[PDB]
Design an enzyme around this catalytic site. Structure first.
Site: not given
Length: 279
Positions: A69, A175, A177, A16, A39, A260, A200
């Site tokens: 990567h 949208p 995913v 937290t 990837d 945060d 998201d």
């Protein structure tokens, strides 16, 4: 379980508060789940993967990761030291060449491949795909990501590194995913992280230590690094039975650390991935 002196991002997703260095997680650790890393490949022989990684598909002359990567991202999903879900099964799909580049037609094939290939794998706790890639807007790329998601795979995609609205990038702008932005160790939006209403969630993306090719390790930055934090988190939460492939992005936003992060543009979610693990 507790991992001392963990990479800051792992400590962040079980905290937290920023500024701690122990990663806390349920010992089930994503066992019985599967994560596809779409990837540049995965160096499966890396000791950090413990035999849990394998290449299942390539569109180039080799399935080897000649870049690093993909190995770095895979490491953040599920390596023993650098990974969120330390007991998950990692599947490599090489849609990017060793320069880190890939044609959209190839990337689309890779996504459709995973939607089918998961039926050849044992993943009783569920299936995740991590897509640390993308370019300009393409409805075709977005629809491929939407299909993969619809097929019962938790799709996590990078928001992009343009410090711009992710609406103009794919598969970031799809949208349905889970589109992931990047933060740093002081809970600032990463300087390069895309933003926008299509995001998201945020995950650790600046100065992320993970596996590299040649059996090595290194620290690099990107929304490419944030994405596998969320992919790994999904796998972990699904193994715990707390959510499903279809509902995990939403569950992660529901349970995220809220408000945060600094320098979050008005209109972008202020949500940081969090496993809400309580010993």
């Amino acid at each position: 379980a507790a991992q001392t002196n963990a990479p800051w991002g792992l400590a962040r997703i079980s905290s937290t508060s920023p500024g701690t260095s122990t990663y806390y997680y349920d010992e089930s650790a994503g066992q019985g789940s599967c994560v596809y890393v779409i990837d540049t490949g995965i160096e499966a022989s890396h000791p950090e993967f413990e035999g849990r990684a394998q290449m299942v598909k390539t569109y180039y002359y080799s399935s080897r990761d000649g870049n690093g990567h993909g190995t770095h991202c895979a490491g953040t999903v599920g390596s023993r030291t650098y990974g969120v879900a330390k007991k998950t099964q990692l599947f490599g799909v090489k849609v990017l060449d060793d320069n880190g580049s890939g044609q959209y037609s190839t990337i689309i094939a890779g996504m459709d491949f995973v939607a089918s290939d998961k039926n050849n794998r044992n993943c009783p706790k569920g299936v995740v795909a991590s897509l640390s890639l993308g370019g300009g807007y393409s409805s075709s790329v977005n629809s491929a990501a939407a299909r993969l998601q619809s097929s019962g795979v938790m799709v996590a995609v990078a928001a992009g590194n343009n410090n711009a609205d992710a609406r103009n990038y794919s598969p970031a702008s799809e949208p349905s995913v889970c589109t992931v932005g990047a933060s740093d160790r002081y809970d600032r939006r990463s300087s390069f992280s895309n933003y926008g209403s299509v995001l998201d969630i945020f995950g650790p993306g600046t100065d992320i230590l993970s596996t590299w090719i040649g059996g090595s390790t290194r620290s690099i930055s990107g929304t490419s690094m944030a994405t596998p934090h969320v992919a790994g988190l999904a796998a972990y939460l699904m193994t715990l039975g707390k959510t499903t492939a279809a509902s995990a992005c939403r569950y992660i936003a529901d349970t995220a650390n809220k408000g945060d992060l600094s320098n979050i543009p008005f209109g972008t979610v202020n949500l940081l991935a969090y496993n809400n693990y309580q010993a």
